[PDB]
Nucleic acid binder design. Sequence first.
DNA 1: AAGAACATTTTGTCCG
DNA 2: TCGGACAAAATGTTCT
Lengths: 74, 76
Amino acid sequence: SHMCLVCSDEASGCHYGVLTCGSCKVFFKRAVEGQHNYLCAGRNDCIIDKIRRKNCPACRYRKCLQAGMNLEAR
Amino acid sequence: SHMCLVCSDEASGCHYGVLTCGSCKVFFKRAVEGQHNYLCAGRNDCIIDKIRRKNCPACRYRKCLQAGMNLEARKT
DNA sequence: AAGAACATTTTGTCCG
DNA sequence: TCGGACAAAATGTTCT
Ligand SMILES: [Zn+2]
Ligand SMILES: [Zn+2]
Ligand SMILES: [Zn+2]
Ligand SMILES: [Zn+2]
């Protein structure tokens, strides 16, 4: 289809199992491969759009997981 | 408390009128000069502390202004 | 589709 | 106190 399931920007393909833009693709890989310690400054329900996805990596990562992203998709 | 009034990190001086840390000092200068247009992804009430201050420039910048930071603190 | 390298943006430290 | 340069972290794009 058309839109990233994580941030609603234009998708570039099906990455890690889910339709996402390229920025969310590489965010999720880095998140999964790094150490998890992200902390929301809100209530763990930040809105994640094209502009606001840079705000909260904790909620952006929860949204990647909720969308079903996983490194071993293939 | 030698604490930054914006994020509670260790303050380094009175910058632009307010006891703040090095990071909040330059963040504030950068926000006004670029006349930045920040948007909160919460509720306009994010927690701003040493770690989370990176997460919402909108609430960080709001706390700066509200604490009374002002580029013309001296001129004043 | 996915990984890597390059690029950019955003933030933070150190001087003077 | 304040500014500049440098440095680092965080995000994003191109893969001639
Ligand atoms: Zn996305
Ligand atoms: Zn959040
Ligand atoms: Zn501060
Ligand atoms: Zn906020």
